[PDB]
Every structure is written in structure tokens, then in C-alpha cells.
């Protein structure tokens, strides 16, 4: 044996063991989702309560990286928040340098290749945390990408992460997401996460929502706690 | 530039089509001085395939000999070792077909240790096949019952030409 | 050992031609027949 | 010499080839190639025959991995 | 990365080290050459060892390299090293010729090679260099001199010296025929003829099978020669003829 | 000479996961809306056990 | 990043080095060739041989022309051969530049037999696969040379490298001489390539170089036709 | 046949071999997918496959083509990060040549320097050799058309007509008989010759959403990829 120590070593099937080994990691994180309407996308974060201890609003999984993009992270909490810090450096360092704000498919293509640069050398390990980004813009549409510790970045309508993600994209392909804006989408994102993670495995937890879209001039933002409200006294009635 | 000398070798094979010999003979004349334009290579592959072709075709009495003896001659000249060796048993093997009884003896007895002392072994089974026959038709059957079975020897040990065997045999 | 093989093989060579006598040139047969065959490996 | 095996055949395509069968398989070459003239009711058997015959029996992919060479 | 290491450094619970002691008996085997020195003029004796019929013979040597106007050397082992090695003291010598205008005594430059080769064997974790070669020159300090080197580093002055693969047998010989400043470019020929007669297996020993190099004094040339292989089989045969007479008397 | 011809048999291609998914599908009491080219599209590398 | 700094390659307990002698023997299974010289300039032949029509063997080739009078063939590995052919162009322009004076064959020879040692002590590498065959005509005499991974160097005569070279080598001691022409020189090399050629010999399937007094030169399909044609 | 460190890095066998080199040859094929590249008598075409296998995701982003210069095309097999930065190392290299020399680059002396590049990976003991390997189509001037290929241990080569990916034996088979005919070669039978030879090899018979198709021609040497409308175009009509 001993294929499977470092990341510079084939199997000889030929594939490489470290990185899956890292995915299995990722597996065991909580939830996320994020879907794509007309004009805009939403996240979903489903937090669980460890103790009573903590507060609400600690150790936040949704980071601004710009002034118009969201993202969104399951895995090791410390490796997501180098890796938000790496991408908001090139999105500074971008604008310096250029002078506009930097497009999704040039900011997506930069994490991806840097995180790729750590599945090569034995003297490095690989990350532990997949993520998604989304944006919108006025002459641009909505944009949704997704990222993986490998280093692949693909387009969605709409994606979830974490344990239960067969699960949860069951219920994501049903709705007609194509035409109906997300004003009403919250609704459903709050209905998809309360029919999961029962209450057997745990007893309490928190939700988050996220917003972008010019429904709030672009930018990127968090959900006022009235909506949130309205959308969580809406999504208990879908438990009948 | 080059296509006379394709127009030669189209002559030599219309001719040789035909069935006409002096014309060979009279080409071979009147082209010698030519050779000194061309690359060596071409030069001796022309000379081989008319001298191969003019031999093929039939036997004359006094023509033959001739050309063979200058060509002999001429690969002395320009010192190619391998293309000698092929025209001098070419020529050890045309004697016989003019009943000849010494020379066909002398020549291959020299030719036997430049040949046995080099690379090929096949020639080795043309000239001792050869000097068996001549012994033979000599009337001295004491001197060859030994050559053939030495020549065969060689042969079945490594071999590749079909029509070897056959006149062995 | 290959000058016992020349010699076993030598009688096999007048044997075929139905001889009684083993002459000189069935040796140097047999000798080139031991030769070719230990050329091989 | 037993099958009809057509007039314009060539076999000297096939013994030139390097690939160093064994002497059972000249065998079921020759077998196969009948029985595929026999499937479509064609009671001579011609080259198109022994072609893909030759191929069915033989089955030895490249094994010629280049850049060592 | 420990993982692949070899540890090419470390001593052992013994007390040595098995580097040097591996390259030691690497260097036993692959060559034969010996030195002679007893009066004006020293000798160096190499057993040829690539002698098949197909080589061109060129470039005047093969194993003995000029260094300075009066320095050469030979050398056993693997042969590439031997090229950087002698590359690198050329420069060594020559800068000494820069800084001093002065022709650089022998033991200097040997102890500064030393130094070098002993640098690897000391730290940073590469294969030693396995080559044992000899030096002869003079020098007006002390005149004529000879010296052997070791791939561990260390060396020292000697008169009759052999490093081929039956040097034992050389060393044993030498020791109890040897006579000490009589010994001209006469005499001491004849004992390395026989000497290399009783290394090699080989009899007859055959002229191009051997080279010969001598250095002598001269008041303005120092004179480093090669003697050709027109004069070594009247050599083999004169030795050949005093030891019949020798054979026969007894 | 002992055994003659060597027969393969591999994994189904997509037109063959339709054609093995409908004889299982038979007898079941199933409902008239059923699309097996999604599930055919879905089933790649099922060996037909 | 960082390497590893610790050379690969030490002696064995019996003092031998086994990294060098795996490569020897890796080498000892390329595409074979020979090279041989007589008096008036020297021939290298070396065979090449696609495995299906596909290839396009005008693309690539085995004979390189390192300047105009210099030759150089290889046997065994296949990308590196690229490597160090680059690095000997740019040791020749490096000794141009200095002596604005051709490089004479044995400097080429000893600096390329150095970069090629210095590769098995430095750290974390493997050495190269090749065997190299150098040809060049300075100073009226020509000149022939090979090297070796180990990096030790010779002037041969006339020899062969690759597979079954022992054969090769016996066939030239049985053949070669001291007297010669060049045209006899690429008929006896041409008819050593073919002791153990493929199935049929064609004027693609064989690339041949010369160099004489007058320069190095490489032989285009014509000619190789020719001499392919009135052989065997 | 082994002993030692042999089967975990880049050094000789006992018998001569290497084999951390051989495993990325077989692990081109994880992927699952195969490309074909023909060259005619004044055009060059190639033909991949695309799967989609869920709805959830955007047909649009998954293109396999990518446009290194206005004059040359690549396609790509094997994994996909290790693809992404070969490509990128290509878009670099050919920028530089251009602002070095001042002229456009020959297709042969770009495809050399991307395998020179690669050659150094399989020399050292860090680096793990990039199993992804590489095709493209260009055209030279006064040469026509030509086509190369790169592979992972650096062996380049210009080919006639070549196929990468799980099933290479056989279209190699299919291409060599057809190729023997030995006949003129125009657009129409190029297109049609390299849809069969895919198509028969995978046995599909399929739709104009399944199959991406690039093309280069001496009267406008820009790549292009061609709409989904002249491909049924050229699709339907081949089916007489």
C-alpha cells in the first residue's frame, strides 16, 4: 500500500487519493443552497445550534467578497475564510489595476487556478471547503458558479452542498425557476430547507438568507428580518 | 535536365520489349562518357540495369563478351568493391555457356577467398554451385562429388532466394 | 561435451546414406550442424 | 486446398504479416472465414472473408507504447 | 520529503562510515597504475584498459594529464569525476601563478584538493567522488616528489606506490627489491616491467597493452615525456632475455 | 482447437438501458405519465442486475 | 517552491552505481544504429519506423545538424534527446562568441559529457536515457565520437548502438577496414541496418547523414531511394 | 520487477521502465469521453461529444473547445483542472512570442514548446506530470492545414487524422481503412467522414444537442465554432 500519503503519487488505476480523501471531508458539512430567478439569486444557509452558548450571527458561512458579489461555503471554517480573503484581494488588486468592477467569469477562472496550484507539490495540502458565488448586474444578467476542492468551476440554474445534497436537489429541480422573479423564490427556499435535516438528528438550528439583484440596485446584501420573518411563517405550513 | 537519362533507360527497355540486341550494344557505346555528370548511385544503377538486361536477353558470339570485360573494367576504375564482385561472377557464370575449360576455373579459385573472407554467403552458393557444374561437365566426376554438398551446407543453414534450392537440387 | 555431440552425430549421417564407413566430410558436416545449432542461444 | 475459396484471392497479403501465430490458428482462420460466407447464404468465399476473418482471430491491440522508442 | 532520504552523512553505531568504505571498494577494482621514483627522473606505469580493435587512439593520452609545466597525474576510478577533478586544480594552479608569479610547490596544491573533496564527506548530502589518482612533479623547495591521493581526503609522500586491483602483490614485491637513490632511468624500468609482468595474468605483456611516462629535470624545460611504443618491446624483450639467463644458470 | 469463439458481454449501452428498463417496468401498477428517458439518462454504468 | 537537495544515485555495498546501470540497460532497448568513417568523411544511419500510416513522418526527424559541419544521432529515450540537443546549440553559439572561430568536435564532445554527468550528483533527479553519436570533419581529419550517460567518452572507428548492437558490432570487425570510400561506407552501413530490419526496407523508413570535408549535410528521399535501390 | 521507491516516483526500474508515467496514460480515461481531429485537402475539422447529465446545468458552460489565437484551435482530453492551466500556459506563451518577434506562430514550434514544458515534470521528484493531454488545428502558410498532438510524458507529434480518448483503438482502426482509399478530400466529406467514424465507433445515432464541432479553412483562417444550425444542417443531410 501507501498510495495514498502524498499528493504527488498516481494509484495505479490512476487517480489521485488525497483529493478524495478532502472530498469525503466536505461531505459532512451542514447545508447550502442557492438558486437562480429572472433577475437575481438567492442563498440559503441552514446553521445548526450547537449549544446555547453561542450567539446568533456568529461565525457567518455568507461573505461579501465585493461590493456586488455573494459567497457561500461548507467545509472547514478557517480554510473558507483564507480562501474569501485571497478572493477579495484579487478583486481589489483587479479593480486597481483595470478600473471596473470585475466580471464573474474572470474572478471564478483566478480562485479556481490558485486553488489548483495545491494538488501538485508534496509539500502542500489540498483544501477542505467548496463554495459558490453569485452576482448579478444590470447589463450582465445573474451569474451562479460553483467550485470544488479539485478545481473546477461550472454554471448552474440552481446547486446545493453539504450532507443531504441528493435530497435537497430533488425538490430544487421541481420548481419552474426559468420565468417566476425572486420575490416568491424565498418562500420556496425557506420550504425546501425546513423539509430536511428532521428533527431525530438534531433539535434546533437558525437559517440565513442573502439577497442580490437590481431589486436592490445590484448589490449584494442581507434580507431585512421582516421578509425572513414571513418566509419562515410561511414555510411551516408546508410540513402538513 | 534529368529525363534524358529516363529516355535512356525507356530506349533500353523498348529495346529489350522489341527484341532487338545490337541496339543495347550501341547505346552502351555511345553513352559511356556520360556517366561523368551524375550522381554515383545513379551512374552504377544504370550500368547494372543494362548490363543485367543485355545479358538476359539472349547470347551472341562475339558481342557479349565485350561488354561485360568493359564494365568489369570500368567498376575497376571507379573502385567500387561490391558491384565488381557482381559483374565478375556475372562473368565466371557466362563462360560456361561458351564451353570454356580453364579460365572458369582460374577466376572463381580467386574469387573464392575475397568472397569467403567477407560479409556474404549467398555468392558463396552461386560460385561453388557453378564450379561444381564446370567440374562435371569437364568429365572429371572424382573432382566435384564434394563442392555441391559443402555449397547445399551453407545454404540450408541460413537462406532466402526460392530459385537457389531448386537448381541445388 | 561438443566433441562427444560431433561424434554421436557423425554416425547418423552415413547412417542415412546406408553406408558402412564414416568419411571425412560427414565430420565436417556434423561440425557445421554443432556450429548453426549453438548459434542459437 | 478443400474450399472452393473463390479464384482472386491472395494469401501471400497474409503470410508476409508478422505476428507469429501459433499453427493452431491458421486452422480457425481459415474455419471462420467459411463460416462467415456460409451466414449470408454465399457458397464461395471471398477476400472481404478472410480480411475480416483474419482480424476476429488475431485481436492484439497496439502494446507499443511509443516514447520509450 | 524524509521519506526519500538517504542519509549519504550520518556515522554508525560501529564508529565508521559507509559511504567512503563503499567507495573504497568501488575504487579497488577498474584500472592498474603505479609510480617509481629513486633518482633524476620519475616514473608512472597505467595498465590500458580500453584496448579493443576498434578505437581510434587519439588525443596522445588517456589517463595522464599535464597540470603545469611540471606537474602530471593519472588517476583510477570513475572516469568522468577524474574530468572535473583535473579541471578544477588547473585553475587553482593557475590562479596561484597569478597571485605569486611563482610556480606553485606540489604539497600546497594537494592539500587544497584535499580540502575539497573532504568538503562533501563533511556536510550537504550528496555521493562522495570516487577517484584515487597520484601526482609527481618538482619544485625548488625539495626537488623531486610523489604523492598519492585517497577519496576519504588523506595522502602522503611516497616512493614506490601501486592502486591498481592486485596492488598488494605490487606493494609486497616492491618492498623487498628496491635500492634506496641508486636506482636511475636504467634499472628502475626493468623492476616496473616485471612488477607489471607479475600484476597482470596476462603474459607477453603486450606493448600496447602498457604506458610508460617519465619526468625529468631540465634547467630551462623540465622535460615530461612519453616514450613511444617503437622503444617498450625492446624493454619486454631485454627483460625477457635476462631472465632466460637467469632461468637457465639455475 | 478447444474453445472456439469468445463471446463479450458488457455494460448497456443508453439504447439498451431502455430497451432492458422497459421488461421490469411491466407488470407493476404504475400511473400513464412515466418518462424512462430520465431515468435512462441518469443511469450511466448500471450493469442490468 | 523548494527541491530536495539530496542526490538520488549512491554506492551499493558492493560499490556499484545501480541507477546509472538501469538506464545503460533502458538505453539498450531503442531504435538501433550505426556509424562509420573512412578517410574521406563520415556516415551515420539510424532507422525510424511509425507504427501506423497515420503518422506524419515528415514532421519530425532523428538526425540533427548542430551547425554546418556538425552531426548528431541518438539511441534510446525520447523527449530529452530535445533537451540536450538544445543545450549543445547553445554551447557551440557560447564558444562562437568568444574565439569567433568554429568549435573543433572534442571541446563539443567534453562540455556536452560534462552537463550530462554534473546531472547524476545534484539533487532529486534521475540522469537522462540517451546515447549520443557525434560527427564532424575540422582540420582535414574527420572525426566520430559517442557518448554515455556516465558520461565517459571514446573515438570509435565505426560502431553500433541499440538493440542486438553486439551482432552489429561483430558484423562491422568482420567487414570494416581502414581503406574505404564513402559510397562503400553508406552500402555496408545500410546493409548492417538491415540484419534485423523490418518486415520491408523503404526510402522513409531509414534516415541517413553525412558530413565531409566539404560540410554535414542530411540525404533527401531521392537519393536515399537511389542507394536503397541496386542494394540488397 | 521492482524494488525500492520505483512505483511511488519518477525513477528507473529494474528492467528500464518508468512508471509514474504510465499511470497518467490510463488516467486520461476517467473522464469518459472522446474527441477526433481529421485533416483535409484545404480544411481541418474536429468532432467531441458533450454529456449533460442533469437539467440543473447549464448546457452553455461546458464546452470542451477553447480559442488559443485567431489563426489556432485546441481541444482537450483527460481531467479538467490540469486542462484549464495547460491551456493558459498556451495562451501565454503564444502572447509572448508575439511581442517578441513581432509575427504570428507556426502551430508546430508552440505545440514543441508546450511539450518541452511538460517534459520537465517527469525529470524532477516534486511534480506530478499533468495527466491531460492536447490537439490542435491550425493553418500554415505555404503548408496548408496541419494538425498535432501532445501528450503527457512530451511526445509531440503532426498526425493525419487522430482520435484521444476511451475508444482510440478502434477509430484508429476505422480511420486507416478509410483513409487508404486514397482520394480527394473536400469540406462536405471531411464533416461527414469524421460525424460517421464517432458515430458508428459509439453506436448513437444522435441529436444536434450533443456534439460540438470546430473548423478552420483557407479562405478565412478565423476558428470558429459552428451554430447548432448548420450542424443538424450538415447532420440531416448526411442521412440520405
Given at each position: ?25 466536505v461531505?459532512?458539512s ?7 430567478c ?9 446553521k ?17 467578497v465585493?461590493?456586488?458579489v ?67 448586474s ?21 446547486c446545493?452542498?453539504?450532507?443531504a ?9 421541481k ?66 | ?60 558470339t ?6 561485360c ?5 570500368w ?6 568493391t ?88 | ?41 | ?14 503470410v ?15 474455419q ?17 472473408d ?16 511509443e516514447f520509450y522508442? | 520529503?524524509?521519506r ?26 577498474a ?5 617509481i ?77 584535499c ?80 612488477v ?45 632475455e ?9 | ?49 | ?47 525510424k ?53 568554429p ?17 547524476t ?26 557518448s ?37 561506407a ?11 530490419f ?35 | ?7 511511488h ?18 488516467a ?6 472522446t ?8 480544411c ?73 514544458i ?34 503527457p ?20 482502426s ?47 483562417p ?19
Open positions: 500500500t501507501g498510495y495514498d500519503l502524498s499528493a504527488s503519487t498516481f494509484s495505479p488505476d490512476g487517480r489521485v487519493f488525497q483529493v478524495e480523501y478532502a472530498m469525503k471531508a461531505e459532512n451542514s447545508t447550502a443552497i442557492g438558486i437562480r429572472k433577475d437575481g439569486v438567492v442563498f440559503g444557509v441552514e445548526l445550534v450547537l449549544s446555547k452558548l453561542y450567539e446568533e450571527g456568529s461565525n457567518k458561512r455568507l461573505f461579501n465585493d461590493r456586488h455573494g459567497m457561500a461555503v461548507a467545509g472547514l471554517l478557517a480554510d473558507a475564510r483564507s480562501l474569501a480573503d485571497i478572493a477579495r484581494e484579487e478583486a481589489s488588486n483587479f479593480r486597481s489595476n483595470f478600473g471596473y468592477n470585475i466580471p464573474l467569469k474572470h474572478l471564478a477562472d483566478r480562485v479556481a487556478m490558485y486553488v489548483h496550484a495545491y494538488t501538485l507539490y508534496s509539500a502542500v495540502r489540498p483544501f477542505g471547503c467548496s463554495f459558490m458565488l453569485g452576482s448579478y444590470v447589463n450582465d444578467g445573474a451569474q451562479l458558479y460553483m467550485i470544488d476542492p479539485s478545481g473546477v468551476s461550472y454554471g448552474y440554474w440552481g446545493a452542498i453539504g450532507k445534497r441528493q435530497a435537497a436537489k430533488t425538490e430544487i429541480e420548481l419552474q425557476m426559468k420565468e417566476m422573479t425572486c420575490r416568491d423564490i424565498v418562500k420556496e427556499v425557506a420550504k425546501i430547507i425546513y423539509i430536511v435535516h428532521d428533527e431525530v438528528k438534531d433539535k434546533a438550528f437558525e437559517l440565513e438568507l442573502s439577497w442580490v439583484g437590481e431589486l436592490t440596485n445590484g448589490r449584494h446584501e442581507i434580507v431585512p428580518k421582516d421578509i425572513r420573518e414571513e418566509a419562515e411563517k410561511y414555510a411551516k405550513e408546508s410540513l402538513k | 535536365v534529368q529525363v534524358k537519362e529516363q529516355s535512356i533507360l525507356e530506349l533500353g527497355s523498348l529495346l529489350a520489349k522489341t527484341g532487338q540486341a545490337a541496339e543495347l550494344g550501341g547505346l552502351l557505346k555511345y553513352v559511356r562518357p556520360f556517366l561523368n555528370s551524375i550522381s554515383k548511385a545513379k551512374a552504377a544503377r544504370l550500368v547494372r540495369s543494362l548490363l543485367d538486361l543485355f545479358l538476359d536477353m539472349e547470347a551472341a562475339g558481342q557479349e563478351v565485350e561488354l570485360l568493359e564494365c568489369i573494367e567498376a575497376k576504375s571507379e573502385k567500387r561490391f558491384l565488381r564482385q557482381a559483374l565478375e561472377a556475372r562473368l565466371v557464370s557466362l563462360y560456361f555457356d561458351t564451353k570454356r575449360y580453364q579460365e572458369a576455373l582460374h577466376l572463381g579459385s580467386q574469387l573464392l577467398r575475397e568472397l569467403k573472407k567477407m560479409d556474404d554467403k549467398a555468392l558463396l552458393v552461386e560460385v561453388q554451385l557453378l564450379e561444381s557444374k564446370t567440374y562435371h561437365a569437364l568429365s572429371n566426376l572424382p573432382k566435384a562429388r564434394a563442392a555441391l554438398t559443402s555449397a547445399r551446407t551453407t545454404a540450408n543453414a541460413i537462406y532466402c532466394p526460392p530459385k537457389l534450392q531448386a537448381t541445388l537440387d | 561435451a561438443e566433441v562427444k555431440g560431433v561424434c554421436t552425430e557423425a554416425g547418423m549421417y552415413a547412417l542415412r546414406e546406408r553406408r558402412v564407413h564414416v568419411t571425412q566430410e560427414d565430420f565436417e558436416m556434423a561440425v557445421a550442424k554443432v556450429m548453426q545449432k549453438d548459434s542459437e542461444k | 486446398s478443400k474450399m472452393n475459396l473463390s479464384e482472386e484471392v491472395d494469401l501471400e497479403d497474409y508476409a504479416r508478422p505476428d507469429k501465430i501459433s499453427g493452431a490458428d491458421i486452422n480457425s482462420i481459415c471462420e472465414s467459411g463460416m462467415l460466407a456460409v451466414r449470408e447464404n454465399r457458397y464461395i468465399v471471398l477476400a472481404k478472410f480480411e475480416k476473418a483474419y482480424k476476429t482471430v488475431i485481436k492484439k491491440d497496439e502494446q507499443e507504447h522508442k | 520529503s524524509r526519500y532520504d538517504s542519509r549519504t552523512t550520518i556515522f554508525s553505531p560501529e564508529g565508521r562510515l559507509y559511504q567512503v568504505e563503499y567507495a573504497m571498494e568501488a575504487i579497488g577494482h584500472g592498474t597504475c603505479l609510480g621514483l629513486a633518482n633524476d627522473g620519475v616514473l608512472l606505469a597505467a595498465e590500458r584498459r580500453n584496448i579493443h580493435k576498434l578505437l581510434d587512439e587519439v588525443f596522445f593520452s588517456e589517463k595522464i594529464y599535464k597540470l603545469n609545466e611540471d606537474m602530471a597525474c593519472s588517476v583510477a576510478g570513475i572516469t568522468s569525476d577524474a574530468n572535473v577533478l583535473t579541471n578544477e586544480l588547473r585553475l587553482i594552479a593557475q590562479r596561484y601563478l597569478l597571485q605569486y608569479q611563482e610556480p606553485i610547490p606540489c604539497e600546497q596544491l594537494v592539500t587544497a584538493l580540502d575539497i573533496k573532504q568538503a562533501y564527506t563533511q556536510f550537504g548530502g550528496k555521493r562522495p567522488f570516487g577517484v584515487s589518482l597520484l601526482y609527481i612533479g618538482w619544485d625548488k623547495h625539495y626537488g623531486f616528489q610523489l604523492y598519492q591521493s585517497d577519496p576519504s581526503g588523506n595522502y602522503g609522500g611516497w616512493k614506490a606506490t601501486c592502486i591498481g586491483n592486485n596492488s598488494a602483490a605490487a606493494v609486497s614485491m616492491l618492498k623487498q627489491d628496491y635500492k634506496e637513490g641508486e636506482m636511475t632511468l636504467k634499472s628502475a624500468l626493468a623492476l616496473a616491467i616485471k607489471l609482468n607479475k600484476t597482470m595474468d596476462v603474459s607477453k605483456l603486450s606493448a600496447e597493452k602498457v604506458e610508460i611516462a617519465t619526468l625529468t629535470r631540465e634547467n630551462g624545460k623540465t622535460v615530461i615525456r612519453v616514450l613511444k611504443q617503437k622503444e617498450v618491446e625492446q624493454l619486454i624483450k631485454k627483460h625477457e635476462e631472465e632466460a639467463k637467469a632461468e637457465r644458470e639455475k | 482447437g478447444r474453445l472456439d469463439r469468445k463471446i463479450h458481454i458488457d455494460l448497456p449501452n443508453e439504447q439498451a438501458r431502455l430497451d432492458i428498463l422497459k421488461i421490469h417496468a411491466g407488470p407493476i401498477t404504475k400511473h400513464g405519465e412515466i418518462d424512462y428517458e430520465a431515468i435512462v439518462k441518469l443511469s450511466d454504468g448500471f450493469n442490468g442486475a | 517552491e523548494r527541491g530536495y537537495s539530496f542526490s538520488l544515485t549512491t554506492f551499493s555495498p558492493s560499490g556499484k552505481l545501480v541507477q546509472i546501470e538501469y538506464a545503460l540497460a533502458a538505453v539498450a532497448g531503442g531504435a538501433p544504429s550505426v556509424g562509420i568513417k573512412a578517410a574521406n568523411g563520415v556516415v551515420l544511419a539510424t532507422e519506423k511509425q507504427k501506423s500510416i497515420l503518422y506524419d513522418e515528415r514532421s519530425v526527424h532523428k538526425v540533427e545538424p548542430i551547425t554546418k559541419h556538425i552531426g548528431l544521432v541518438y539511441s534510446g529515450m525520447g523527449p530529452d534527446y530535445r533537451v540536450l540537443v538544445h543545450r549543445a546549440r547553445k554551447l557551440a553559439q557560447q564558444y562562437y562568441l568568444v574565439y569567433q572561430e568549435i573543433p568536435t572534442a571541446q563539443l564532445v567534453q562540455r556536452v559529457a560534462s552537463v550530462m554527468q554534473e546531472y550528483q545534484s539533487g532529486g533527479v534521475r540522469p537522462f536515457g540517451v546515447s549520443l553519436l557525434i560527427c564532424g570533419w575540422n582540420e582535414g581529419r574527420p572525426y566520430l565520437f559517442q554515455d550517460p556516465s558520461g565517459a567518452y571514446f573515438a570509435w572507428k565505426a560502431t553500433a548502438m541499440g538493440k542486438n548492437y553486439v551482432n552489429g558490432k561483430t558484423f562491422l570487425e568482420k567487414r570494416y577496414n581502414e581503406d574505404l570510400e564513402l559510397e562503400d553508406i552500402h555496408t552501413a545500410i546493409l548492417t541496418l538491415k540484419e534485423s523490418e518486415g520491408q526496407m523503404t526510402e522513409d523508413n531509414i534516415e541517413v547523414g553525412i558530413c565531409n570535408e566539404a560540410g554535414f549535410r542530411r540525404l533527401t528521399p531521392t537519393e536515399v531511394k537511389d542507394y536503397l535501390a541496386a542494394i540488397a | 520487477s521492482s524494488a525500492g521507491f520505483d512505483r516516483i519518477t525513477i528507473f526500474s529494474p528492467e528500464g521502465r518508468l512508471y509514474q508515467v504510465e499511470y497518467a496514460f490510463k486520461i480515461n476517467q473522464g469518459g469521453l474527441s477526433v481531429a481529421v485533416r483535409g485537402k484545404d481541418a475539422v474536429i468532432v467531441t461529444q458533450k454529456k449533460v447529465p442533469d437539467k440543473l446545468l447549464d448546457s452553455s458552460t461546458v464546452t470542451h473547445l477553447f480559442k488559443i489565437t485567431e489563426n489556432i484551435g485546441c481541444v482537450m482530453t483527460g481531467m479538467t483542472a490540469d486542462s484549464r492551466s495547460q491551456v493558459q500556459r498556451a495562451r501565454y506563451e503564444a502572447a509572448n512570442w508575439k511581442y517578441k518577434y513581432g509575427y504570428e506562430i507556426p502551430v508546430d514550434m508552440l505545440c514543441k514548446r508546450i511539450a518541452d511538460s517534459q520537465v515534470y517527469t525529470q524532477n521528484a516534486e511534480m506530478r506530470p499533468l495527466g491531460c493531454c492536447m490537439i490542435l488545428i491550425g493553418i500554415d502558410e505555404e503548408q496548408g492545414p496541419q494538425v498535432y498532438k501532445c501528450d510524458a512530451g511526445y509531440y507529434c503532426g498526425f493525419k487524422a487522430t482520435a484521444a480518448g476511451v475508444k482510440q483503438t478502434e477509430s484508429t476505422f480511420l486507416e481503412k478509410k483513409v487508404k482509399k486514397k482520394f480527394d478530400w473536400t469540406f462536405e466529406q471531411t464533416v461527414e467522414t469524421a460525424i460517421t467514424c464517432l458515430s458508428t465507433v459509439l453506436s448513437i445515432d444522435f441529436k444536434p444537442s450533443e456534439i460540438e464541432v470546430g473548423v478552420v479553412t483557407v479562405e478565412n478565423k476558428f470558429r465554432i459552428l451554430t447548432e444550425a448548420e450542424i443538424d444542417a450538415h447532420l440531416v443531410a448526411l442521412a440520405e
